[PDB]
Design a protein around this ligand. Sequence first.
Ligand SMILES: OC[C@H]1O[C@@H](O[C@@H]2[C@@H](O)[C@H](O[C@@H]3[C@@H](O)[C@H](O)O[C@H](CO)[C@H]3O)O[C@H](CO)[C@H]2O)[C@H](O)[C@@H](O)[C@@H]1O
Ligand code: XKP
Ligand code: DCR
Ligand code: PLM
Ligand code: PLM
Ligand code: PLM
Ligand code: PLM
Ligand code: PLM
Ligand code: PLM
Ligand code: PLM
Ligand code: D10
Ligand code: DD9
Ligand code: DD9
Ligand code: DD9
Ligand code: DD9
Ligand code: HP6
Ligand code: HP6
Ligand code: MG
Lengths: 169, 25, 98, 999
Amino acid sequence: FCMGMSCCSGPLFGMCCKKTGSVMAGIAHGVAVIVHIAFFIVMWVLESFNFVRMLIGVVTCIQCQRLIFHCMTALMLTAWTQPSRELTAKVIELSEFAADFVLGHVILICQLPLIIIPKIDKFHSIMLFWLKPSRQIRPPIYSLKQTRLRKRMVKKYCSLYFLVLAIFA
Amino acid sequence: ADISNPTRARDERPLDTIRSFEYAV
Amino acid sequence: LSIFIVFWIAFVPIVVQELIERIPFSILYSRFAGSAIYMGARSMLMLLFGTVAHWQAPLLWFWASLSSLIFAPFVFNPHQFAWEDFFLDYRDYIRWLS
Amino acid sequence: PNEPYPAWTADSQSPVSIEQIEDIFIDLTNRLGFQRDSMRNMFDHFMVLLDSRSSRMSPDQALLSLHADYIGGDTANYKKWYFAAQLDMDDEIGFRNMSLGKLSNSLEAADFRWKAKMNQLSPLERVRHIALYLLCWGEANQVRFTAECLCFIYKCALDYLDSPLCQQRQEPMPEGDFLNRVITPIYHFIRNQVYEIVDGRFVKRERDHNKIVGYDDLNQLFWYPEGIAKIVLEDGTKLIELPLEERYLRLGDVVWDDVFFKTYKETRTWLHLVTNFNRIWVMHISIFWMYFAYNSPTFYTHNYQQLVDNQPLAAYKWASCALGGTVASLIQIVATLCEWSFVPRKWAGAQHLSRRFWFLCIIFGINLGPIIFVFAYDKDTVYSTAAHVVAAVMFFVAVATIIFFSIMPLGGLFTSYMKKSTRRYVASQTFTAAFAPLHGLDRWMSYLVWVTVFAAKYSESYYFLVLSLRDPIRILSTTAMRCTGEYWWGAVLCKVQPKIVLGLVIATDFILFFLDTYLWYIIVNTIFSVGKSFYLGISILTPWRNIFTRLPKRIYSKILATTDMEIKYKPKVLISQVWNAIIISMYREHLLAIDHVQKLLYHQVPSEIEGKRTLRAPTFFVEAERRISFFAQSLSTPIPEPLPVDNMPTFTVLTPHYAERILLSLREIIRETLLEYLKQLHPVEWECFVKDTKILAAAPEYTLRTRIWASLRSQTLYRTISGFMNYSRAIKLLYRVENPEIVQMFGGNAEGLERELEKMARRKFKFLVSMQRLAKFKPHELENAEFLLRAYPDLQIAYLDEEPPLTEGEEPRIYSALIDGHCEILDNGRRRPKFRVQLSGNPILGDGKSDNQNHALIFYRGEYIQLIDANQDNYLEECLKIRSVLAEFEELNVEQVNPYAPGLRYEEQTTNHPVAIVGAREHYGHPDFINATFMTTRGGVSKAEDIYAGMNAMLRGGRIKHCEYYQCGKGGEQMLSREYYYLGTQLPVDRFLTFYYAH
RNA sequence: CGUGUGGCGUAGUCAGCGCGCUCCCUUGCAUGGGAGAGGUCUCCGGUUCGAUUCCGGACUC
Ligand SMILES: OC[C@H]1O[C@@H](O[C@@H]2[C@@H](O)[C@H](O[C@@H]3[C@@H](O)[C@H](O)O[C@H](CO)[C@H]3O)O[C@H](CO)[C@H]2O)[C@H](O)[C@@H](O)[C@@H]1O
Ligand SMILES: CCCCCCCCCC(=O)O[C@H](COC(=O)CCCCCCC)COP(=O)(O)OCCN
Ligand SMILES: CCCCCCCCCCCCCCCCCCCC(=O)O
Ligand SMILES: CCCCCCCCCCCCCCCC(=O)O
Ligand SMILES: CCCCCCCCCCCCCCCC(=O)O
Ligand SMILES: CCCCCCCCCCCCCCCC(=O)O
Ligand SMILES: CCCCCCCCCCCCCCCC(=O)O
Ligand SMILES: CCCCCCCCCCCCCCCC(=O)O
Ligand SMILES: CCCCCCCCCCCCCCCC(=O)O
Ligand SMILES: CCCCCCCCCCCCCCCC(=O)O
Ligand SMILES: CCCCCCCCCC
Ligand SMILES: CCCCCCCCC
Ligand SMILES: CCCCCCCCC
Ligand SMILES: CCCCCCCCC
Ligand SMILES: CCCCCCCCC
Ligand SMILES: CCCCCCC
Ligand SMILES: CCCCCCC
Ligand SMILES: [Mg+2]
């Protein structure tokens, strides 16, 4: 669909989105999660309370996908001939990006109880005493204009983070 | 005038050159 | 039992090396990307299935080793507690992604 | 005195005068057309070598030893090439290397004739022979990386010189003939395979390495007569058809695209793994099979049931256990099959593999035939003691074959049986399997370590396979999970779960079998290392104050060469002169405070009416602390005694340079701040320096001294230069302490004594820095370089430069040039070089530092080289032990004997394996120190780069050592190489096991 | 009373040359060139078609 949308007009892509790759990347993430939940629900059709019969299904899915990608790469190692190779690379790159995204957000979300409490700062700084140099220089003075934008970004990105957490829960 | 080194004569023998290097110090 | 004795023997040199001396998220993540992360995530899924279906006491040890394997680079990062640093790193990671 | 080479000229016993060697050089140059400005360079090189060797031995012994080292001895490379590629004597050398254990038209006859011819040469002939090789080595450019090509060229030229063709020619050969007609075509071949000419430029072409010919693939053609026979002229005629004396004249018609080919090729990596390390899978997998089959009756038991406890016949246990032999044989066959696809088919040594296959199949057969007889149903139904004796016999045949294939190396299995006239070996034994043997206590230690490791590992693995696996195997293999299954396939997926589980259990145990030998290796080494401490008598429990109180006597016995000196002074007046030097050196580096120094020096403040009270021991004996502590500690280990600094040899320190910063600019000092960072990082040094400023003092001088202070704390070249120029002051101090008659006789003329001390210290030590971009620095970089030449007048720098082409639209000319601090200033602002030598083109073809060192390597002097890098540092107390470090190559205190004496034989000689590398610590080792004669005659000091040099030196026949009282202040693709292929398939078993479990 | 004009310094006709930034490329450190991007004039309100500009209030120094 992306390639059929006026591929003969280069400036049209710049008019619409110079970096539509990120857009399709987000779309691919969404569809991967949705198709996951579809399998979760189809497996729970018989399973109103059974949590054991979908985990191994997830594992099986992931392994089969990796096998398919590996086979395609090995075949490619040995008109639209070159576009075929380009698309084979592109799909694999996109799938890797989606997996990395999910894993990274999963890692980040788990740290929340650590930062919720405010006393962790000094107790972590005890490690600075444990460190051999144990020298810290005061931060350079920042203008209040630098402070305003900093607070705005902190509020905005915190809101986005909590939105992602809400989606995942 | 020497071919590889234009600043030296052609007929200068090696011992002349070592003596010159000695006098350069 | 056997695997943990072997791992301890191989891990003594690191303890010896490091017990005598007493970062943005994007580069830190990319450094361990493709090495002991994807394999770990794949492994904790299977470990979770085995744990839920049938509970064996020694698997309690395994939940230790893998967990630390993911949490080592981040526990040792300086000033990871600060709100401003964490949210700035979040911004930087998001921008590196896109 | 006041003479350049005092150990040769000022002696009256010299067999050949200086004015008789200069005209030998001049005559060769006139006859074969060398360059003049390289003849001068090599005359200087040769004379310094003679001086260095004649200062601890007689002049005639010096000339004879040099001739033995370069052309005529068993430590020569030219002799080895001559015996392999001319007399065709490789297999006999292999046999001799094999049978040296019992030894200690024929090889003895050829050696007898060679010694007879070399024993009757005049000294003039020896000077001529050495001179021709050095002259050839000085032009060879990139052909220096390929030694056997150089040997071929030298032989051809020598054959031409003695002919009646040369000695009747009238006019001389035009200058520059050797480089134009002989050397440039080979360089053109080499370059025409990494680059191509596109639109008038050289652009690197991309192609697979299996079609690129490197240095080694050229080098290996000149190892066999079969390669020499392929060289063809433009007429289509062979080179070797001409009479011997005419081949050098035509050596410009040879076409090198029709000659050179590839000799070793790469493949997938697991094939390399399977072939290189077969001796380890043979010994793990076969024993695992033995153990698993003996303790697992269920698979070969008729109507097996633990309730009835019926066992199968013992014949079945032995016949089942006796498949370890077939498993080992199969592994060896697969290894040979994988090896056959590395080497070209018609190249010499590739027939051997074919024969090796046949024998292997035979063994496979004899080890599979009899077992079938037991498993045939004809003797199944009839119990006989014949079946029992057959099984019992085949068990020990299987044990025998497992041991045999675990011990013997793959290359060299059945060489003693062929007795054929053709090649018996896959690779050349002269240049690839010449390992230096072990002698003494370490030879038995190596056997004992490995015996202990493997005995413990096997006896322990059996008792953890017997019980963790006997009951699961018996239960999971006999249960019946009776179900309907899935009728699309059937029940075949519900009776098979227990057995799939059993297969997985066994596979994990099989994998775990490999991880136990590593543990036992670690444990046994640590116990042996602890146990050897008592014999070594290492004392760490002694108080720190118990080293410092013994320090003076150690200084007197191990730093000074006091034994030679006639005893005329008290040991305090000698130790004072060293201790005070160390302390003041530390003080001046802004590293100790004014009040700290007085606590430590020897003092003369007490009264001079009584000479005894003049000197008093310090209060200490009754960064700085770390240095002094390591100094005192390292002095406790055994140290070899020194020579007087008038007998010590010459050595060079060689450094590369590209893109590093010589000095810090003012912008990087006042902008971003660096100064504040450093002050916050080194505060006490900053306050000491500002105290120093008020002690003495736009302010240009303050600017420059601040720049110096800031440069002596960062990644700068000046830091390294200033650190490593401590050898000079160390040698001056040692020379003046050791003999006081000179200091007495000069009597107040401090200037004359300074000139004397500098003159002696100048001929023992050289510094060399190689900059490849001095031709195109911008003006401030040039200003820095000129400043360095001003601070240290004796430093030397080598660079590259370019000239416009002689004819229009052709290639520009390229030269390599040398300068130092005594060359005058030209009106152009540049300095005139001492030497300019023309090359055949741009020398930098591949990335790295190896090509950087190869072009400046023709300007080194001495006998030993120290290889450092851009960021390294040194200290005076460490530089004070150079004599003891250099005495570690085992050449300084040995007696001299005639190499060509009729009575000697090869087995009695004690000079067969020289030391090639010495590495320092706080067969792998980074090479700090290098034996220059050994190294520079067999390829470079480095190769396209450090571990490969160590492995090549080992394969060629040298030894590598480690020094424990010196410190150096330094701060995937391997498995597909030839070196692993040669090491893995030819080492004896114990050395192989030591090599494998490290890297 | 004065006062937070792009990240800083700011200047001003009833939003600027610099300076960083951001991108590209050359040169072994840079430098130089081409291209573009970052601004409510402390903040909150009133008047004026329109307010840094005329005024009222608020915070900091
Ligand atoms: O990144 C450093 C190093 O990582 C190596 O990867 C693995 C390790 O992830 C792994 O770590 C532990 C396991 O050995 C053990 O079995 O489980 C614990 C969990 O409790 C793990 O933390 O160890 C293996 C060794 O068996 C390593 O190979 C890379 O291999 C290595 O290349 C890399 O340098
Ligand atoms: C909810 C499912 C969403 C993901 C579905 C698509 C995954 C597809 C699997 C794949 O893409 O494989 C790996 C990634 O594996 C994984 O981490 C999968 C597990 C991630 C979720 C763990 C949750 C705790 C990519 O790296 P590679 O191993 O291929 O190596 C290439 C090196 N450059
Ligand atoms: C990764 C390395 C793998 C090494 C090989 C390990 C594989 C071990 C396989 C062992 C097979 C055991 C199969 C047990 C069932 C045998 C047939 C039973 C016949 C019967 O009694 O019905
Ligand atoms: C995040 C890791 C998952 C949870 C951590 C391990 C959970 C295991 C312990 C919970 C179950 C143990 C209690 C039941 C044991 C029993 O029945 O005897
Ligand atoms: C670990 C060993 C497991 C296998 C059990 C013993 C191996 C032999 C089993 C039968 C092999 C062939 C015997 C019948 C075939 C024949 O006699 O021709
Ligand atoms: C190597 C090929 C043969 C393999 C079998 C080796 C032994 C063959 C049998 C020899 C006879 C053994 C029994 C003798 C008694 C008999 O049956 O008459
Ligand atoms: C390679 C193995 C060789 C054959 C085995 C060794 C020779 C023994 C042959 C069979 C011996 C059986 C005993 C014969 C005596 C008898 O049956 O009366
Ligand atoms: C299955 C047999 C195991 C063999 C393992 C070898 C371990 C011992 C290695 C050193 C001892 C053998 C030394 C042999 C010396 C020699 O033959 O030249
Ligand atoms: C170089 C190898 C040393 C010789 C091998 C030593 C161990 C071989 C014997 C294995 C154990 C067989 C005896 C079983 C009884 C037991 O160990 O418990
Ligand atoms: C290499 C990983 C383990 C390999 C799997 C081990 C063998 C699994 C299947 C064994 C049972 C099926 C084959 C025999 C037929 C049968 O059980 O009746
Ligand atoms: C049953 C007695 C112990 C058997 C194992 C022996 C261990 C040897 C390791 C040195
Ligand atoms: C009861 C002793 C068990 C020891 C297990 C060690 C296994 C070595 C790999
Ligand atoms: C206890 C008998 C086991 C048989 C295995 C013998 C192993 C020989 C190395
Ligand atoms: C398992 C047999 C391996 C044999 C490799 C042969 C390679 C020839 C291409
Ligand atoms: C029936 C007992 C026969 C034992 C034969 C053992 C052979 C050892 C050489
Ligand atoms: C090496 C296993 C094959 C033996 C075949 C016996 C029939
Ligand atoms: C008839 C059973 C066939 C099993 C195939 C599984 C891949
Ligand atoms: Mg070193």
